[PDB]
Ligand binder design. Structure first.
Ligand SMILES: Cc1cc2nc3c(=O)[nH]c(=O)nc-3n(C[C@H](O)[C@H](O)[C@H](O)COP(=O)(O)OP(=O)(O)OC[C@H]3O[C@@H](n4cnc5c(N)ncnc54)[C@H](O)[C@@H]3O)c2cc1C
Ligand SMILES: C/C=C/CC/C=C/CC/C=C/CCCCCCC(=O)OC[C@H](COP(=O)(O)OCCN)OC(=O)CCCCCCC/C=C/C/C=C/CCC
Ligand code: HEM
Ligand SMILES: COC1=C(OC)C(=O)C(CC=C(C)C)=C(C)C1=O
Ligand code: SF4
Ligand code: F3S
Ligand code: FES
Lengths: 616, 129, 250, 153
């Protein structure tokens, strides 16, 4: 607090949700209508959240288009996760998917419909019937080309009837910790420069992803990883951050998502020599393979000179063979985006595309009840009292090493809701709102002030741009031990340059220079932890593909028959969660590794799925 | 430092609270319907008064323009003469002034019909120039 | 070099006796993306980090970057720079909004008014939440096209002079169309009560068919029509049809 | 008697006046377009006529002057016929316009022709018919007066 003066305002809520995308708003609803005094803190108006950009759909085995079983969806999720996913959590996800989505419709979400008047469903990458044996599933429930927008506007409007109290354009700075427990959140109010401390029994982190740590992504400028930075700063280790989804078809020059629904509706990829090359890379599932696989194929075609256009450095998504009636009813959003950003009529021409950073299966680790955890070799999983987390900022981990399309809006709602279910069940009127420690939040303001007045010789925008470029180069689709190790050098230096930071706008009111400089502090933590974990992982699993360790390394070799082998010990196989523990001041990162949870919630309801060679 | 003061919820319209103590403002729209039908009715009236002239038209123009301009000026008053810009008493005053306008408009029209050439003839004479 | 010039409204509340200003910025059009938002980000990042504005998406879906560009209310993120370098392009905040700073306007009456319409599904006979899908035909849900797409950016409401004069009493085009959106939804039972909330002479009836809302809407939607439709409904010249009946199998 | 949202709306305005925040410019910066210009024109004309009937009906009532002396006065000025027929065209246009455009607006009130090409077509139609009908109703008696002045019998 040392140079300037700061007006600190204190609040007292039962629970405090950081974020108002799908996940955050859903928690807010359940808690609101369960009588709790609920504060929603969000750094933008909730409709602006990234959930709103979501296009393709939300998964649930409704069986609107053909028969379906939630178990076939559970299967597909697990195989998608390349056996890094936690099966308790993937179970809870898919068990609940039909209730969660129907709730949405019942809330008023205007799903596209079938002639029978049921929710329309399209096909999407990585999904099947009959536990992998059957054909391409139709589980992906849509509102055309803008499923996320509907879902978010519905969840926002419905939040308006459950007496939550919104603190909008409030930038979260730190969790308020008190001897291992979270007692609330401290934030800056953009409108009037005030600093706000919220005292709360519970705190939910629902801040979204850190896609903006890369040079090119489909994410919003607001995807800065503040939430996972909040946890770092609170002394919590993050999980599986090296697992970064490259969605296959972002727009080439610009980064804008084109939905996997394009392919689900019958679109396909094409290379310079006119080939639907995904027949070679995935004979069964073709252009609807898992996202990690499909982006790789694409990336190889470039490297091997089948890339398309002037620089032969991207490829073509072809829809023009599909009828305009279908292109209009099923993909209006992208039809227009295609025109605006690439000058493309999708009924006549194909869209230039290239894999692009898009999701973060990584995040704050939690049990299946969405409660944040710490982990030691000797004590196991210890919950962090008071603290839940959900959505993309979380790692439950329902996605493991590759997230399956339309499982995210899903996960956000299901575990958003889980958060409120799990708190009504356990938090009881007995327990009263915790008092704040003396000095609580003082370190956060000090950082703010220090950044606000930052003297140095590197402006916040330059340092960011070089972070984003370093990262694009070293931690991309295909990684390698050296390139990674050089990458980590350049990244821990950029972390060093952080002390030579320049800001300029010295105001407290709507100072976005300041917040974007906090966002770079927040992004760097994420980025450094992402790359060191990536550098250390000498295997290939899901999105994370090592050229110099091209094999997936499980406790067995699941290509051979199981019986007859001896189980490899924990320290030589990589079927295990990465944990990054970072000192915010120094930047020093250390690693531990936490075992995957293979058992389901209930064997009598569903059997777990032992690992196998992953192929589409 | 964090030696601070207890804060309050920001200003937020709770629309379920609002639904406890509100009975719908009696409707408008009935009045909006007649406003507009009336304007439609005035469509033939204007071509008629190009052809047929005299004292009995002068009365129909007079009633129909008065009553139409009444509603017309009530709208413009409620746009540019607002409490926020004028203060509350001055705004009620220009509101009242809209009633003065209608009443004086009629009295002036009636007078002109009744002690001068009247509307239709008045037009003829400027046109004859 | 092709150097383009922008006149950008400034306002810094924290400076005392502070008044709004225009500020001119030159931008090398080949060092910069093709959209106005790119120029704003360039300028912030290189020339002037005190330059302040909202944004989030990059694809015209969030609605954060709404502002006035070359006189029209639009989205900076999908609004092409006019490369005629001789002309300067003016950039003001959304019209007739109170401003916090630079291009960032106070948006809370707009939001408040959004809450005013109860934008959520209301069912007169209460239904168990997860249990089943409500029936709705294609042609019924197709009534929601042109409507559910609204990104709540406020370009239309800040173009409507009626709204300019009576924001406190006239709900405006953005909110009215979302009022209409929950009115013509077959699954919604409370049609008449939604109308009852805006019966008076100001809420919907202050729309003077100026038609700026439909002209300026960056998602090519048509609030003016939804307002007419409310006017027809509200004067009893039409009624909402009834839900098409749910087949007994379903 | 206001709705709850209108009460809240009013407290917002005071809150914003109390915060001494500027109002983002509007009229003076918004691009003129054939949408609001014509609403402009419809309101100007509607008022300019309402006003004329007040200044006239009360003017000639309250004053000693009568309308007949006022007509002779201006004839006594010896104005060219063209400028007189222009003053006449100018009196006609607001009646033709506001009348025509007023049915267009009642269309709009009934959710008719609200799409952009329609909006823009009906604008020209209304604007152009008015210019037509006014020029018709002024040039017609003057052409058929110059006939009477030289028409054989
Ligand atoms: C273009 C695109 C399309 C997608 N399409 C799909 C799809 O079709 N199907 C699917 O399943 N998934 C999709 N995804 C993934 C999915 O949409 C997201 O992962 C999901 O919406 C995340 O929701 P969330 O609530 O966790 O966070 P978000 O929706 O990102 O919102 C995060 C919230 O946290 C708040 N916040 C962040 N930092 C702070 C801070 N410091 N202080 C206060 N508040 C803060 C933000 O203001 C915001 O409200 C898509 C992603 C993208 C980019
Ligand atoms: C400053 C702004 C001032 C504005 C003027 C204010 C006046 C407003 C009142 C006007 C309403 C009455 C007009 C008609 C009238 O009384 O006299 C007709 C006369 C002719 O007599 P005259 O020429 O002597 O009579 C005929 C020859 N014997 O005057 C006309 O010529 C009227 C011309 C109007 C144009 C035609 C109407 C357009 C209709 C459109 C609708 C179409 C279909 C439905
Ligand atoms: C002859 C046919 C006419 C029709 C069909 C007609 C129709 C209408 C309509 C529909 C409106 C409402 C428009 C709005 O709300 O902005 C209106 C407004 C108005 N009319 Fe007329 N009108 C006619 C003639 C006249 C005449 C002769 C006058 C003469 C004074 C007049 C004065 C007005 C005024 C002052 C308004 C209010 C304008 C506003 O609020 O912007 N009208 N008219
Ligand atoms: C009739 O519609 C219009 C207004 O009222 C709603 C205006 O106030 C304005 C601007 C303000 C004045 C005082 C003409 C214009 C331009 C307009 O077209
Ligand atoms: S209607 Fe068009 S303009 Fe008005 S809000 Fe919705 S999107 Fe923005
Ligand atoms: S601009 Fe305004 S007055 Fe009517 S149709 Fe559009 S709302
Ligand atoms: S950045 Fe969201 S619409 Fe412009």
């Amino acid at each position: 607090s040392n140079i300037a003066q700061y007006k600190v305002i204190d609040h007292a809520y039962d629970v405090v949700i950081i974020g108002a995308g799908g996940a955050g708003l859903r928690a807010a609803m359940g808690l609101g209508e369960a009588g709790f005094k609920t504060a929603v803190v969000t750094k933008m108006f909730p409709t602006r959240s990234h959930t709103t950009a979501a296009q393709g759909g939300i998964n649930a085995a409704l069986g609107s288009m053909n028969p379906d079983d939630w178990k076939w969806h559970f299967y597909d999720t697990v195989k998608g996760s390349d056996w890094l996913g936690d099966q308790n959590a993937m179970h809870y996800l898919t068990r609940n998917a039909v209730e969660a989505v129907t709730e949405l419709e019942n809330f008023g979400m205007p799903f596209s419909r079938t002639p029978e008047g049921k929710i329309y469903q399209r096909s999407f990458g990585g999904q099947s019937n009959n536990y992998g044996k059957g054909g391409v599933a139709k589980r992906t429930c849509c509102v055309a080309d803008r499923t996320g927008h509907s879902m978010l506007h519905t969840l926002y409007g419905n939040s308006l009837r459950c007496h939550c109290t919104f603190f909008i354009e409030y930038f979260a700075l730190d969790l308020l910790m008190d001897k291992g427990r979270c007692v609330g959140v401290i934030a800056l109010c953009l409108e009037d420069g005030t600093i706000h401390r919220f005292r709360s029994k519970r705190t939910i982190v629902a801040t979204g992803g850190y896609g903006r740590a890369y040079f090119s992504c489909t994410t919003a400028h607001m995807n800065t990883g503040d939430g996972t930075a909040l946890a770092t700063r609170a002394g919590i280790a993050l999980e599986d951050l090296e697992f970064i989804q490259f969605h296959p078809t972002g727009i080439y020059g610009v980064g804008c998502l084109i939905t996997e629904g394009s392919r689900g509706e019958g679109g396909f990829l094409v290379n310079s020599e006119g080939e639907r090359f995904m027949e070679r890379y995935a004979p069964k599932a073709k252009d609807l393979a898992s996202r990690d696989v499909v982006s790789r194929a694409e990336t190889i075609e470039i490297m091997e000179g089948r890339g398309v256009g002037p620089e032969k450095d991207h490829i073509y998504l072809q829809l023009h063979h599909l009828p305009a009636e279908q292109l209009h009813q099923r993909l209006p959003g992208i039809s227009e985006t295609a025109k605006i950003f690439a000058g493309v009529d999708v009924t006549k021409e194909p869209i230039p595309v290239i894999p692009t950073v898009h999701y973060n299966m990584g995040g704050i680790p939690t049990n299946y009840k969405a409660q944040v955890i710490k982990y030691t070799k000797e004590g196991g999983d210890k919950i962090v009292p008071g603290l839940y987390a959900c959505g993309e900022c979380a790692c439950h981990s329902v996605h493991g090493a590759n997230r399956l399309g339309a499982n995210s809006l899903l996960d956000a709602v299901v575990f958003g809701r889980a958060c409120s279910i799990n708190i009504k069940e356990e938090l009881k009127p007995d327990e009263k709102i915790p008092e704040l420690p003396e000095g609580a939040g003082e370190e956060s303001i000090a950082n703010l002030d220090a950044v606000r007045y930052a003297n140095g010789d590197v402006p916040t925008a330059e340092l960011r741009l070089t972070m984003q470029k370093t990262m694009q180069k070293h931690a991309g689709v295909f990684r390698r031990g050296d390139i990674l190790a050089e990458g980590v050098k350049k990244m821990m230096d950029l972390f060093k340059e952080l002390k030579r930071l320049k800001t300029t706008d010295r105001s407290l009111i709507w100072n976005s220079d300041l917040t974007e400089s906090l966002e770079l502090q927040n992004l760097m933590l994420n980025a450094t932890q992402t790359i060191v974990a990536a550098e250390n992982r000498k295997e290939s699993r899901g999105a994370h593909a090592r050229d110099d360790f091209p094999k997936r390394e499980d406790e067995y070799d699941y290509s051979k028959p199981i019986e007859g082998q001896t189980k490899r010990p924990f320290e030589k196989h990589w079927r295990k969660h990465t944990l990054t523990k970072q000192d915010p001041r120094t930047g020093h990162i250390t690693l531990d590794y936490r075992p995957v949870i293979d058992k389901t919630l209930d064997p009598a309801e569903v059997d777990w799925i032992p690992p196998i060679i992953r192929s589409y | 430092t964090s030696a601070a003061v207890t804060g309050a919820a920001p200003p937020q319209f709770d629309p379920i609270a609002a639904e406890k103590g509100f009975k719908p403002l009696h409707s408008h729209g009935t009045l909006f319907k007649i406003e507009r039908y009336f304007a439609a009715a005035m469509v033939p009236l204007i071509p008629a008064a190009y052809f047929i002239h005299g004292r009995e038209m002068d009365l129909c123009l007079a009633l129909a323009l008065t009553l139409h301009v009444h509603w017309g000026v009530w709208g413009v008053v409620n746009d540019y003469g607002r409490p926020f810009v004028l203060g509350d008493t001055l705004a009620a005053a220009v509101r009242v002034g809209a009633y003065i306008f209608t009443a004086c408009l009629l009295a002036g029209l009636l007078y002109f019909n009744e002690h001068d050439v009247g509307l239709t003839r008045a037009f003829e004479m400027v046109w004859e120039l | 070099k092709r150097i383009k010039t922008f006149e950008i409204y400034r306002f810094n509340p924290e400076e005392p006796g502070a008044k709004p200003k225009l500020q001119k910025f030159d931008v090398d059009l080949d060092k910069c993306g093709t959209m106005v938002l790119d120029a704003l980000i360039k300028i912030k990042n290189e020339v002037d980090p005190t330059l302040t504005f909202r944004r989030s998406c990059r694809e015209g879906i969030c609605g954060s970057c709404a502002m006035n560009i070359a006189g029209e209310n639009t989205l900076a993120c999908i609004c092409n720079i006019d490369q005629n370098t001789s002309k300067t392009t003016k950039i003001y905040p959304l019209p007739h909004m109170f401003v916090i700073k630079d291009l960032v306007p106070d948006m809370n009456l707009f939001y408040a008014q959004y809450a005013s319409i109860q934008p959520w599904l209301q069912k007169k006979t209460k239904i168990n939440l997860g249990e089943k899908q409500q029936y709705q035909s294609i042609k019924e849900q197709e009534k929601l096209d042109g409507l559910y797409e609204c990104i709540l950016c406020a370009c239309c409401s800040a173009s409507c002079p009626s709204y300019w004069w009576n924001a406190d009493k006239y709900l405006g085009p953005a909110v009215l169309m979302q009022a209409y959106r929950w009115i013509i939804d077959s699954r919604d039972d409370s049609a008449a009560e939604r109308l009852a909330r805006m019966q008076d002479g100001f809420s919907a009836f202050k729309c003077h068919t100026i038609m700026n809302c439909t002209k300026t809407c960056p998602k090519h939607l048509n609030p003016a029509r939804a307002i007419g439709e409310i006017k027809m409904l509200l004067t009893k010249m039409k009624t909402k049809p009834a839900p098409l009946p749910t087949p007994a199998n379903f | 008697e206001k709705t709850p949202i209108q009460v809240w709306g009013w407290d917002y305005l005071m809150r914003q006046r109390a915060l001494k925040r500027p109002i983002a410019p509007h009229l003076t910066i918004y691009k003129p377009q054939m949408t609001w210009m014509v609403s402009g024109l419809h309101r100007v004309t509607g008022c300019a006529m309402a006003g004329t009937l007040l200044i006239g009906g009360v003017g000639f009532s309250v004053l000693p002057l009568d309308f007949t002396t006022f007509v002779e006065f201006i004839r006594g000025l010896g104005i060219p016929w063209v400028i007189l027929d222009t003053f006449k065209f100018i009196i006609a246009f607001p009646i033709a316009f506001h009348t025509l455009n007023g049915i267009r607006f009642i269309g709009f009130d009934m959710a008719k022709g609200t799409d952009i090409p329609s909006i823009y077509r009906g604008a020209y139609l209304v604007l152009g018919l008015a210019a037509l009908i006014s020029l018709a109703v002024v040039v017609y008696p003057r052409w058929e007066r110059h006939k009477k002045a030289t028409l054989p019998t």
